[PDB]
Write a protein that binds this DNA or RNA. Structure first.
Lengths: 48, 48, 49, 378
RNA sequence: ACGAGUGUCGUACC
RNA sequence: AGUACACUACU
RNA sequence: UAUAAUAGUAGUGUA
């Protein structure tokens, strides 16, 4: 996934939470990984 | 045509025969007594 | 100023026979001064870049 | 330069003379020592130093007395190797066996009784260069490289060396390099293995290996050397011997090694002489050959010891992947270049690059380089 | 002898 | 027995 | 954002 909105991450991980939830930040993480009740925000960087 | 002995050589082998003999030399074959004077002579000649 | 090595003066002062055209002695002022003034020859390898 | 036309003004191409081993003689050190002493004292004819050589053979003679020589050497070596630190404060005591004043294994005093004073002076002053003169403008004397006669002489010398050294040793090679890496070299390339085996089968490899071993033995023995002791150095070959004349110990600065090669051969003119033969005399059972005294720095001796590797590498690199070349010619060129420890070949190896590459190039001032920079030193 | 050299050297010294 | 540019060895 | 790092000794190749 690329530039997935954080609100989409919240909705996918927690479908039960309703809209009008706490306002997700402007951050658009590159990827997210949910395992063992832990959410990892993954961002790719190509720099020296 | 080969250089140091009869036969035919490839261009790579020809360049090898041209350039390898330089490495047959032995370091430290000079004598200080004469090379000191020779180097001084050439330096002072250029300066003059 | 380029300083001539001590051993070079050692084996140049013990010749016992004057050289035909001694470039070393001319520049050294008849072996009066070990140093020789070098102007245009920046020394080998010093100014590579 | 001072151009010379005489063939006798040549300097040695290789500071060594070699002759094939004798299968009919034992390879024991004492037997070879006795044979060398007898052959030196059995020299016939008249010459400047022949009396000196016979007297030296008399000095290195143990006669029928042989067992206590081995006992003496073993007893001294056992005490010498029993201490990590060099044995000091104790003086080595000479022990005459028969006509030989043996100080150490293969180390003998100059028996002034055996030698005439004039002969000893000739051997030490005019032959070994020891004590010559005391504490003339000229120019560097070099052979005429473009002379037809000089080039013919050089070609004849190379042809003779190729003739003598191309013959097989008659023995299975069985050496360290082969037994330890033959499988790897053979799997990498069959032809390389075949070329290496051919190198080991010929007399070039035996000659250079014997010379390297002899130089190593000379370096080993020369550390315990005194002003009145001449050492005997031996190699695997039972016909090649070395006389190590008195000189300063190696550990000091500018230390040099003085040695002379002796070769015993059944028939005369069957020796590899790379311009370093003093004289071929007739002794019992055959002909002895004595080379001119050679003085060498420690760096040159180190290169000489390392020379078998250089020879093998050069031969295999020139013959690599080339079926149109004759291995004998490559080995003939490599024997001389590998053991070249003089500046004469140094003055030729480097300018060859520029000369041949400018000749092969499109635009080049090869004429200017040859005229103003190419300065052969032959 | 050998090494070096179109620089007088190394070459053990009394 | 120096300047630089490296590579490889040992502590 | 193609830029921050550098023990001592020895050997080798290069200019």
């Amino acid at each position: 996934r690329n530039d997935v909105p954080f609100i989409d991450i919240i909705l996918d991980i927690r479908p039960e939470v309703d809209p009008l939830t706490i306002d997700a930040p402007h951050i658009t993480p590159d990827n997210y990984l949910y395992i063992n009740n832990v959410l990892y925000i993954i961002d790719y960087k190509v720099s020296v | 045509t080969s250089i140091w002995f009869p036969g035919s050589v490839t261009l790579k082998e020809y360049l090898t025969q041209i350039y390898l003999p330089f490495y047959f030399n032995a370091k430290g074959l000079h004598e200080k007594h004469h090379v000191m004077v020779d180097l001084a002579k050439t330096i002072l000649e250029i300066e003059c | 100023e380029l300083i001539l090595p001590d051993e070079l003066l050692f084996n140049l002062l013990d010749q016992k026979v004057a050289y035909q055209n001694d470039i070393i002695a001319t520049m050294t002022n008849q072996l009066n001064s070990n140093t020789v003034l070098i102007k245009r020859n920046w020394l080998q390898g010093n100014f590579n870049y | 330069r001072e151009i010379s036309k005489s063939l006798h003004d040549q300097k040695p191409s290789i500071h060594f003379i070699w002759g094939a081993h004798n299968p009919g003689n034992s390879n024991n050190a004492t037997f070879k020592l006795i044979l060398l002493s007898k052959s030196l004292q059995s020299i016939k004819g008249i010459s400047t130093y022949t009396e000196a050589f016979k007297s030296l053979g008399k000095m290195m003679d143990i006669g029928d007395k042989a067992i206590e020589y081995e006992e003496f050497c073993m007893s001294l070596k056992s005490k010498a190797r029993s201490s990590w630190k060099q044995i000091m404060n104790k003086k080595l005591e000479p022990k005459q066996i028969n006509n030989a004043l043996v100080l150490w294994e293969q180390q003998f005093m100059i028996n002034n009784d055996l030698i005439d004073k004039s002969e000893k002076l000739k051997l030490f002053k005019n032959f070994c260069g020891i004590g010559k003169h005391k504490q003339e403008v000229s120019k560097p004397k070099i052979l005429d490289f473009d002379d037809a006669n000089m080039y013919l002489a050089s070609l004849t010398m190379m042809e003779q060396s190729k003739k003598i050294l191309s013959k097989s040793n008659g023995l299975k090679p069985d050496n360290f390099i082969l037994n330890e890496f033959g499988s790897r070299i053979k799997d990498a390339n069959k032809e390389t293995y075949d070329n290496m085996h051919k190198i080991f089968e010929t007399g070039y490899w035996q000659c250079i290996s014997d010379f390297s071993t002899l130089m190593k033995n000379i370096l080993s023995v020369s550390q315990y050397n005194r002003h009145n002791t001449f050492r005997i150095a031996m190699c695997a070959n039972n016909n090649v011997f070395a006389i190590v004349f008195p000189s300063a110990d190696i550990k000091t600065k500018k230390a040099t090694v003085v040695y002379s090669i002796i070769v015993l051969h059944k028939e005369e003119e069957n020796i590899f002489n790379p311009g370093c033969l003093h004289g071929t005399f007739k002794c019992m059972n055959g002909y002895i050959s004595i080379s001119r005294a050679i003085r060498l720095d420690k760096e040159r001796c180190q290169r000489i010891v390392s020379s078998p590797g250089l020879f093998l590498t050069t031969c295999l690199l020139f013959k690599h992947d080339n079926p149109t070349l004759v291995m004998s010619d490559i080995m003939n060129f490599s024997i001389y270049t590998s053991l070249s420890i003089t500046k004469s070949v140094l003055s030729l190896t480097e300018p060859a690059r520029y000369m041949i590459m400018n000749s092969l190039a499109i635009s080049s001032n090869v004429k200017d380089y040859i005229a103003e920079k190419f300065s052969p030193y032959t």
